[PDB]
Amino acid sequence: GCATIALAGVGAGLGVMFGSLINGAARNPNIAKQLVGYALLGFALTESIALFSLLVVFLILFA
Amino acid sequence: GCATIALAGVGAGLGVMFGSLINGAARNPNIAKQLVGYALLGFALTESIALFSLLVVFLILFA
Amino acid sequence: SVLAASKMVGAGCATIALAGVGAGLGVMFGSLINGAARNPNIAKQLVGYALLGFALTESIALFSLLVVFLILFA
Amino acid sequence: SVLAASKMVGAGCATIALAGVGAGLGVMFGSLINGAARNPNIAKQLVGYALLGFALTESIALFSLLVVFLILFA
Amino acid sequence: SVLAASKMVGAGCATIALAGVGAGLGVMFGSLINGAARNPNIAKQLVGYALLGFALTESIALFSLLVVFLILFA
Amino acid sequence: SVLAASKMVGAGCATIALAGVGAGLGVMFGSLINGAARNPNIAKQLVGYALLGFALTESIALFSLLVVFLILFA
Amino acid sequence: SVLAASKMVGAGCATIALAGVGAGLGVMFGSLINGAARNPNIAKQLVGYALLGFALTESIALFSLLVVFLILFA
Amino acid sequence: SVLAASKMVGAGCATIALAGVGAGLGVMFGSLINGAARNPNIAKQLVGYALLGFALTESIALFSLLVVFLILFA
Amino acid sequence: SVLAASKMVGAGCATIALAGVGAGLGVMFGSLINGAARNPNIAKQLVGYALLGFALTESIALFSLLVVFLILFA
Amino acid sequence: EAAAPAGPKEFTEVWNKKAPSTLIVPEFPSNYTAVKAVGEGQVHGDAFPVNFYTPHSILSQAQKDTVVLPGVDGYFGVKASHVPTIAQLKPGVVELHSGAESEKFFVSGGFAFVHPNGVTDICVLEAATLDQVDPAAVKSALAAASAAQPTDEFEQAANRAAIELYSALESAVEAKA
Amino acid sequence: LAIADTYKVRVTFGQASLIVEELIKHNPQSYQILFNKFRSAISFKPTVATILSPDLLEKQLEDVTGNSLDAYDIEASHERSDVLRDLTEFHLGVTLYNAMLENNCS
Amino acid sequence: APSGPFYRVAGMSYLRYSNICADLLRNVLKEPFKAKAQARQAIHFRQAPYVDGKAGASKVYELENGIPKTAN
């Protein structure tokens, strides 16, 4: 139970990332397909750490 | 009980993303719906953190 | 009654998520104030954005509030 | 008295979500000060958005207060 | 007694809600500085907004000092 | 002697308000620096607003210290 | 000896307060460096304000260590 | 032997305060880069202010390691 | 055997200082990205400032790892 | 720190002593304006005077109660007693509202000062209003502006200016209200 | 330097800006423009317009008990010393265009 | 070498950047107003540097499209 609280950090990080993507599109939206191209990269590289937390959640429960 | 603190991070990230929606829309009102088209994607995409947390808080209770 | 004890203390450790959702709502409303101070001609649209932000942010609050009563009364 | 013991311990651990609404109110009223600092013509409208954000952020404060009264007095 | 022991531990962990009140008070009283630094000619309006923000986020600190007096003495 | 042990464990968790009031004091005294770096013509008035903000966020720390000295000797 | 054992975790739960003071001093010196980059002509008064703000925000940290030494040895 | 248990968990809970020193050091070293990118002609003096800031904000990291090594070996 | 179990529960909550040091490292590298985006004609120096920030933040990371490997093996 | 207190007043009594004396003092561009910056007044309530200026026209010297400018962070609106501001303008549309009347000028860049007495000076190079621009040739200009990529940074910056200008113009000619 | 053939067709802002950019190859500390102000068809008052170089004399000449330009909150892309570097070149452009238009009409 | 906004780092001055923006707006007006916008766009002068006191070369500008987009 106290192992899945690391998900709060990756949620709080992903929120500021997908808000800075909104502001980055609102600056100059000609590059918006490249801003989302870096934003999904950041989403994947933060969900890597989210899965790193979920792995030890499953490891405590099932092993 | 100590597992669902993780929705605090989803709440903080989603509040700052919906606040960056306002700061993105007030910066250029000409694109004030495409930024919602990114914001609802951000909300639904980092809710997978909240999906994983409300999967864990039931995976320990009812299993 | 250790189950009747643990349901209370799990609810107390479960209602901590409302802190993050409240801080998110405060950041959201502060950004509504700042958006309505950038160009106040668009404020009638920006409060409409902030209220969808409110009703979508409190979804996470009621997600914890099912769990603050699912582990309490069930 | 273990049940009342965990009721009071869960109530004390339950009231800590008020920290989040405190930080939220702080950043919202700070943005109210900044929005009044930019253009005071909107200062009445910005107070009108600020107190609305105060009420809809105190939504979570009364949610945590009814939760802490449902663990301690229910 | 486990009742008064839970009272002490619970009223101790109840007042970490003042951390967010102090952080929000710092953010608000800090936005007051650069809000006056944008334009000093409306500074008396801004300190009024700041004291409104202080007293209206002090509702949270009065609420979290309600719960400590409520758990300790009831 | 679980009371006199719980008094200390509650007294420890009571001072976590001294995280948030320190963080708010840092943000406040940081924006004072940025406000003085905007215009040092009002470098005398902004320190007045910052010392006022320090004294009015100090009341949070005094509430926490009256809690922790309300715990230890009552 | 649950008193002299629990005073150890009272100290460990009390000295977490230095984290917020650490983040506050970090944002204070960070705004100091960002203030020197605006105008280096006032880079003497800016460090003079930063040392004053560091003196008034370290006092929260010494409130916390004062509570640590009052818990641990009194 | 609960003294040599409670000291271990008290040290673990005591060294949590090196988190906020980490965030403070991070925002200060990031603000050094931002200030060095604003005006590069003073990019030696800002390293002076950043090392001053680091050696004065790691004092709190040394504070928490004092409390850790006080409740580990004293 | 409460001592070798308490060593594990202490080494649990010891090493969450790495959370704050990671949140510091991330905002330091994010300000490195912003400083590179402002003027890339300096950015070979800002890598040198970001690495000198990372090492002196690693210092706190190594202190937290020192505590979490001191609790297990002493 | 103001160690040469110069101006239209101080230059005369230096010019009285070095110039040949039958020459009267040359006039100065301070002596041709009345709208002062630090001179208190010039708001009278909610109508603040905004001077839309351009090298070839005075597109608006009349009064509005709110002005929307496209600053470099994005659009921003100037109310009655706005904070004093040297805003740099992105190429976007400028709005001047006096009530019902709302006229839109799509400008091409420049600055936009707001002075401490409350006046506003929108200063742009080419400020064409929205009817005299087509929605057609923006695509045929932007498509080549999204095509030709020299390795010369000079025309790279010039073509990036073309991209952002035509992008804002296409978003402003699609979203005509 | 000598500039001619400038009123053969007309005066445009591109012309005044290119004459300005030929002036800014020298990096002086103040530019001065000497022209006749067309006040009527009788009076052509000679004037001196002066333009200060930004990071050399403009911020120092404005510094009174602090600064008189810190009242204006900058909203540029980069810092203030690179928006005055553009603003003074713009001021040179407008005073050159207006000067050689008033002098042509007088 | 230069540190500034994106035009100034590439050697292009501010006036050239804003005039290139002006030229690019003037190209995409309507043909009833493209004629009157071609009035204010042209550049015709010559500049002659005098390093000795009397003598120097010439540089004829005859440009009817606007400020030079090419390097200068």
PDB file of C-alpha atoms in Angstrom, chain D residues 4-44:
ATOM      1  CA  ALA D   4     -12.160   5.208  19.694  1.00  0.00           C
ATOM      2  CA  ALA D   5      -8.348   5.185  19.709  1.00  0.00           C
ATOM      3  CA  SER D   6      -8.105   4.488  15.990  1.00  0.00           C
ATOM      4  CA  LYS D   7     -11.011   6.872  15.410  1.00  0.00           C
ATOM      5  CA  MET D   8      -8.997   9.709  16.924  1.00  0.00           C
ATOM      6  CA  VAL D   9      -5.707   8.663  15.303  1.00  0.00           C
ATOM      7  CA  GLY D  10      -7.423   8.417  11.916  1.00  0.00           C
ATOM      8  CA  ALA D  11      -9.073  11.775  12.545  1.00  0.00           C
ATOM      9  CA  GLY D  12      -5.723  13.442  13.192  1.00  0.00           C
ATOM     10  CA  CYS D  13      -4.217  11.783  10.132  1.00  0.00           C
ATOM     11  CA  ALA D  14      -7.439  12.701   8.310  1.00  0.00           C
ATOM     12  CA  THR D  15      -7.305  16.444   8.903  1.00  0.00           C
ATOM     13  CA  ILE D  16      -3.989  16.765   6.998  1.00  0.00           C
ATOM     14  CA  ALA D  17      -5.685  17.367   3.651  1.00  0.00           C
ATOM     15  CA  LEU D  18      -6.242  20.930   4.833  1.00  0.00           C
ATOM     16  CA  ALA D  19      -2.564  21.567   4.000  1.00  0.00           C
ATOM     17  CA  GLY D  20      -3.336  21.109   0.317  1.00  0.00           C
ATOM     18  CA  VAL D  21      -6.268  23.509   0.363  1.00  0.00           C
ATOM     19  CA  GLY D  22      -4.069  25.949   2.278  1.00  0.00           C
ATOM     20  CA  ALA D  23      -1.415  25.914  -0.441  1.00  0.00           C
ATOM     21  CA  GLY D  24      -4.173  26.185  -3.024  1.00  0.00           C
ATOM     22  CA  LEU D  25      -5.756  29.214  -1.377  1.00  0.00           C
ATOM     23  CA  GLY D  26      -2.320  30.769  -1.081  1.00  0.00           C
ATOM     24  CA  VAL D  27      -1.440  30.452  -4.750  1.00  0.00           C
ATOM     25  CA  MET D  28      -4.950  31.617  -5.703  1.00  0.00           C
ATOM     26  CA  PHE D  29      -4.825  34.760  -3.580  1.00  0.00           C
ATOM     27  CA  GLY D  30      -1.286  35.422  -4.764  1.00  0.00           C
ATOM     28  CA  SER D  31      -2.555  35.320  -8.326  1.00  0.00           C
ATOM     29  CA  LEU D  32      -5.317  37.674  -7.202  1.00  0.00           C
ATOM     30  CA  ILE D  33      -2.636  40.104  -6.014  1.00  0.00           C
ATOM     31  CA  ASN D  34      -0.744  39.732  -9.308  1.00  0.00           C
ATOM     32  CA  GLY D  35      -3.885  40.228 -11.357  1.00  0.00           C
ATOM     33  CA  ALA D  36      -4.710  43.334  -9.399  1.00  0.00           C
ATOM     34  CA  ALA D  37      -1.113  44.458  -9.915  1.00  0.00           C
ATOM     35  CA  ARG D  38      -1.371  44.231 -13.697  1.00  0.00           C
ATOM     36  CA  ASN D  39      -4.595  46.132 -14.304  1.00  0.00           C
ATOM     37  CA  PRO D  40      -6.781  47.423 -11.441  1.00  0.00           C
ATOM     38  CA  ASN D  41      -9.736  47.958 -13.803  1.00  0.00           C
ATOM     39  CA  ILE D  42     -10.464  44.223 -13.440  1.00  0.00           C
ATOM     40  CA  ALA D  43      -9.849  44.172  -9.675  1.00  0.00           C
ATOM     41  CA  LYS D  44     -13.548  43.823  -8.895  1.00  0.00           C
TER      42      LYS D  44
END
